[PDB]
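Hey all, sorry for the wall of text incoming. These are the three entities for the joint prediction.
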Amino acid sequence: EAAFRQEGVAVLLAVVIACWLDVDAITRVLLISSVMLVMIVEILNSAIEAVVDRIGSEYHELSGRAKDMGSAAVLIAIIVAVITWCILLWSH
Amino acid sequence: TTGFTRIIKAAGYSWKGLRAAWINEAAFRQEGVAVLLAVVIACWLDVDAITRVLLISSVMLVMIVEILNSAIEAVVDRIGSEYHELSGRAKDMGSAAVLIAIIVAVITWCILLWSHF
Amino acid sequence: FTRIIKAAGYSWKGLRAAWINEAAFRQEGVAVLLAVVIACWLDVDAITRVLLISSVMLVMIVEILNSAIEAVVDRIGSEYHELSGRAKDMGSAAVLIAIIVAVITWCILLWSHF
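and here's what came out:
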């Protein structure tokens, strides 16, 4: 997946970024755990998009709501990642 | 640009899928008020930024799981049309996952406000 | 309080299903409660106890979802041959990450305290 490599790039960098910076181990945890939290969901979204694909040829509101909600869940986690990182980096 | 157009389309799928989660389910609105209040509550109450995050990240996280549950109940509904007999365990376990996050949020908030207050 | 409370019964009957119907779920399940108790027995910063637990619980919340995914595949892949067998595999992948996070969290957090 090219977008998974696009987000995959986003995640590993952010992890590495949190590591070069000297910061409280607690905050390093929060930075990494926040970005990692995004990584777990995207995979689950990848997991959902996999099942939805297995059954059904046509469009549905029952089918596409699942993908759209799946795409929605990923979005929120990234906001958290953005917000978490913002509030945490605001102090420094 | 054509690498950044892929990202705005995901935002559109997210928005149309969030409002889908929002409108189609009444139970999703009950956590949202709890979450927005608790987030705003966590924002106006003065505490160290790490603790705000932990308060917010617990509260925001409960909301995140519920979205996945809405995604599962959507999938189970799809099989509700192709198949005839549903097992319901997926919905039942999905409902179980949501609970745990709230426990965490409560516990997170309990332990966090106890420490400071 | 009755409109939503049926879900709490749905949680229990769906959890007692998760506990009993799946045997492998108990190996991490035993591990988390231990990890929680351990995190509680250690005298530590309240924030870190949260972080230890919030890290360990995060594994737990996700794993139930894998049980939820593995359930859907079972109704479908009951008599059919799936090319999309990966959905279970992606589910197992998310859990691994959570445990990695937990390990790293506990690794990095316990390094700090000691």
